[PDB]
Amino acid sequence: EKIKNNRQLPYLVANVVEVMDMNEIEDKENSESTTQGGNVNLDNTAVGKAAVV
């Protein structure tokens, strides 16, 4: 129900330029390629799964 609210109209039309996907434990921590301790997450606090649109 929360997701359907979004999927309901109108919404922006765009195109995907490229996809960039990184995984958890990129150094030792994080899906980013920066240096910080913990916050192993998919994209929530440690972004690396991404689309550039």
Binding site: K4, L9, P10, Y11, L12, V13
Partner: peptide
């Protein structure tokens, strides 16, 4: 987990060159 019966939704272009889907 959803059903919908909406068709012929159509994607417009504004004269500002910005595209949107509408109902």
């Amino acid at each position: 987990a959803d059903e919908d019966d909406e068709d012929a939704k159509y994607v417009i272009n504004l004269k500002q060159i910005a595209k949107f889907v509408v109902g």
